[PDB]
Design a binder for this molecule. Structure first.
Ligand SMILES: CCCCCCCCCCCC[N+](C)(C)CCCS(=O)(=O)O
Ligand SMILES: CCCCCCCCCCCC[N+](C)(C)CCCS(=O)(=O)O
Ligand code: SF4
Ligand code: SF4
Ligand code: SF4
Ligand code: FCO
Ligand SMILES: [Cl-]
Ligand SMILES: [Fe+2]
Ligand code: NI
Lengths: 481, 277
């Protein structure tokens, strides 16, 4: 009865992923995710001037490098005892916030949209599965195509926004220990705001409405992909200089309950990962990275992070669920008009629909709208001309941890400094939380679990396997590093 | 209309992303009328063994005529297992095996980005994967297919598109074989096209007068002085960023902070520490 389907490479994600599922009676009944490429940034970093980390770590991933930059400089700030000036904190938020817009827009249109929208008869939009379950009307499919094309311009403008104070993108030069390297001028602030206005218009008028509208043709996709229904947020985008208030506040949600985040409860397991057996179960402060590509039973270069034993997911759904902000005006209206749902705040979607294949796309669109308001605020808060950096000395001995939220989910970097050089550097990244293999006790990773129950009514056209995976916006470069 | 297969090895996808940032007037035309992007894991419609098999069927039809773009380095340690790029009917395909298969049959290979070109970060001190540059890997395995390096971490999109344009003109004027021979003429000793990598950053820097005067910035946010003391590697770097700048001309590394020498064969180790001379 059972059929095993292997998909390598899973495409329209970042990086190298193999998915293997077992299908029985038209549904996925088991799953394994394999991250098949390793670079080993945690060992490459050793012995370097710690200030180099904020450049080296960005090369983990050219889609989300500002996230790694941010985590790294936050770790360095702590280890160096550097107090980032108020204006530099805001400048960092403007650099990084612009890439949230870029990344979510890239994800929905250029990675995910072909899951629902039929492209024209030209590579790379053909060939594809003969029965791809593409349900949109002539008009709606055309809207998807036109918006994919427009989004190419919009995501590029987002990178212009990042580069204004960031230097260039991918791989910014503009964030360093102690703040930001370039004070915003009045002139460049006008340039940033002009671009921001165009991005806002696209997000409000095209992107958010299209996700709900496509979602309304795929209501069945809100009923699958729940997985553990457990979420993590470690906080991001500091709104003051005392490390208190953040745009996204930290918290954990599991078994229907909200609880504080305590990073000491993070452990990384490796039984099913290609790393030396003796390195299993380490918290990141004690982390070790010893590759073992021939180890029997292992199936991924992604370690298996667990929070107090729990397998959690991260990303826009996780943050929006944990923080529970008010929904966008257009979202509220489409929920009413298309879904018959009266909703005010994000959790009004209900746990079941929020933690679903389509729910995660909706969360990402809502979060993009939410970020618009934050950037609007920072553009009013920033003061042209005010210094954005301090120049701290390299300490001989120190440690630091930087916590932030990458567009795909929770990210932390830990650095230990000895003899003025990097002694250890450990990275616990977003897609690591989502796309990891089983832990030592046999508990599946978040996406592995969310695959359970996914419908596969046609083994010759098993499109929902990768649709589920793409809803999580996986980045296997980040997950493995 | 020749096919292009874009293979990712130990890459970060930043070389793909930088290309997505192109405002080159020829970009859309290159993708829609001149070549056909038949395989690219980040953006293509199909997936899995079907995508692999599609690439294979096209490659066979266009033997000797398709182009490879490689993003990221090629790891040779542990029998290639540090980079698996696909699976065909239960058979894993490492980056090593993919280049051994497709490399011999390509018209030419573009090694895009410092990883593919020179090894880059995955090959840096502390690495354990045998991360290898494309030209070196191919040569080590007796594969003589022409390789052009377009480095940078990431490259500017103009360097990638502009190299394609150079090839296009050359191949139109002299045919495939003759054209590639003409492109070889304008490559420096590191396999880089001289139109983009033929000039030194420092020699053309707007802050050179300050360098000469010995006026050095002591904080990044001081934009008046030379960035040399802050670690600028412009003196040892061959790229035209001073001119075209970055992301629609809105900034570049030297104005914003420092140059880290990202296009150079010794990046990153030979350009590190980044924040002192
Ligand atoms: C974004 C809200 C979509 C809710 C749609 C829910 C459709 C499924 C409801 C099934 C309840 C049993
Ligand atoms: C990078 C992936 C190759 C596709 C590049 C697409 C660039 C489109 C720009 C159109 C304006
Ligand atoms: S050259 Fe740099 S940007 Fe390109 S794949 Fe390598 S690390 Fe990424
Ligand atoms: S050291 Fe850097 S900032 Fe100074 S003149 Fe040379 S390239 Fe310009
Ligand atoms: S200025 Fe230097 S670091 Fe920046 S892109 Fe050019 S060569 Fe690379
Ligand atoms: N966003 C992003 Fe990249 C991932 N996953 C990080 O961190
Ligand atoms: Cl990011
Ligand atoms: Fe890690
Ligand atoms: Ni990433």
């Amino acid at each position: 009865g059972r059929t095993t389907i292997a998909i390598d490479p899973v495409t329209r994600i970042e990086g190298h992923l193999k998915a293997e599922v077992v299908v029985e009676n038209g549904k996925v009944v088991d799953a394994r995710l394999s991250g098949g490429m390793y670079r080993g940034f945690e060992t490459i970093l050793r012995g370097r001037d710690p200030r180099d980390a904020s450049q080296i770590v960005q090369r983990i991933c050219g889609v989300c490098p500002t996230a790694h930059s941010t985590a790294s400089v936050l770790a360095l700030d702590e280890a160096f005892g550097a107090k980032v000036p108020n204006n530099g904190r805001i400048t960092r938020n403007l650099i990084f916030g612009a890439n949230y817009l870029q990344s979510h827009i890239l994800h929905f249109y250029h990675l995910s949209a072909q899951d629902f929208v039929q492209g024209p008869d030209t590579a790379p939009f053909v060939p594809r599965f003969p029965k791809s379950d593409l349900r949109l009307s002539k008009e709606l499919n055309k809207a998807g195509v036109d918006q994919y094309i427009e989004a190419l311009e919009v995501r590029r403008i987002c990178h212009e926004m990042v580069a204004l104070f960031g230097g260039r993108m991918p791989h910014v030069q503009g964030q360093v220990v102690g703040g930001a390297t370039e004070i915003p001028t009045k002139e460049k602030l006008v340039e940033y705001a002009a671009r921001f206005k165009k991005v806002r218009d696209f997000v409000e008028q095209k992107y958010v409405p299209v996700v709900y509208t496509i979602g309304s043709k795929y209501k069945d996709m809100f009923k699958v992909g729940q997985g553990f229904k457990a979420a993590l947020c470690v906080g991001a985008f500091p709104l003051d200089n005392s490390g208190k208030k953040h745009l996204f506040m930290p918290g954990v949600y599991a078994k229907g309950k909200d609880m504080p985040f305590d990073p000491s409860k993070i452990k990384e397991y490796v039984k099913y990962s290609w790393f030396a057996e003796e390195t299993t179960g380490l918290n990141y402060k004690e982390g070790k990275t010893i590759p073992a590509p021939d180890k029997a039973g292992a199936y991924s270069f992604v370690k298996a992070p667990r929070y107090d034993g729990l397998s959690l997911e991260v990303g826009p759904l996780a943050r929006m669920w944990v923080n529970n902000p008010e929904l966008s005006p257009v979202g509220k209206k489409l929920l009413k008009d298309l879904f018959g749902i009266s909703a005010k705040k994000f959790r009004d979607l209900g746990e079941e629909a929020a933690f679903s294949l389509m729910g995660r796309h909706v969360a990402r669109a809502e979060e993009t709208y939410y970020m618009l308001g934050a950037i609007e605020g920072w553009l009013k808060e920033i003061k042209a001309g005010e210094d954005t950096v301090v120049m701290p000395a390299v300490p001989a001995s120190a440690e630091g941890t930087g916590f932030t939220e990458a567009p795909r989910g929770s990210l932390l970097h830990y650095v230990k400094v000895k003899d003025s050089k990097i002694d250890n550097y450990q990275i616990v990244s977003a897609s690591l939380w989502n796309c990891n293999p089983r832990d030592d006790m046999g508990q599946r990773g978040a996406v592995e679990e969310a695959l359970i129950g996914i419908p596969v009514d046609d083994i010759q056209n098993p499109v929902n396997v990768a649709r589920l995976i793409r809803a999580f916006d996986p980045x296997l470069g980040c997950a493995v590093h | 209309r020749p096919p292009v297969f874009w293979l990712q090895g130990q890459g970060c996808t930043g070389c793909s992303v930088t290309l997505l940032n192109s405002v080159h007037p020829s970009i859309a035309d290159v993708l829609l009328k001149v070549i056909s992007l038949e395989f690219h894991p980040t953006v293509m419609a199909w997936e899995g063994e079907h995508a692999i098999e599609h690439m294979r069927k096209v490659a066979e039809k266009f033997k000797g005529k398709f182009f490879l773009v490689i993003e990221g380095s090629v790891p040779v340690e542990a029998d290639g297992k540090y980079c698996i790029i696909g699976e065909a009917n239960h058979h894993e395909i490492s980056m090593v095996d993919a280049l051994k298969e497709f490399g011999p049959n390509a018209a030419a290979v573009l090694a895009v980005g410092t990883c593919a070109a020179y090894g880059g970060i995955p090959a840096a001190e502390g690495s354990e994967t045998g991360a290898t540059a494309v030209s070196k890997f191919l040569g080590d395995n007796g594969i003589k297919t022409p390789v052009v390096n377009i480095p940078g971490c990431p490259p500017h999109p103009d360097w990638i598109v502009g190299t394609v344009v150079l090839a296009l003109d050359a191949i139109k004027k002299n045919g495939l074989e003759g054209g590639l021979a003409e492109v070889v003429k304008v490559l420096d000793s590191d396999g880089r096209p001289t139109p983009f990598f033929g000039r030194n950053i420092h020699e053309n820097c707007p802050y050179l007068d300050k360098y000469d005067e010995g006026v050095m910035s002591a904080t990044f946010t001081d934009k008046v002085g030379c960035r040399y003391d802050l670690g600028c590697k412009g003196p040892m770097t061959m790229a035209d960023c001073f001119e075209r700048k970055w992301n629609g001309g809105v900034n570049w590394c030297v104005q914003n902070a420092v140059c880290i020498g990202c296009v150079e064969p010794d990046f990153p180790d030979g350009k590190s520490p980044f924040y002192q001379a």
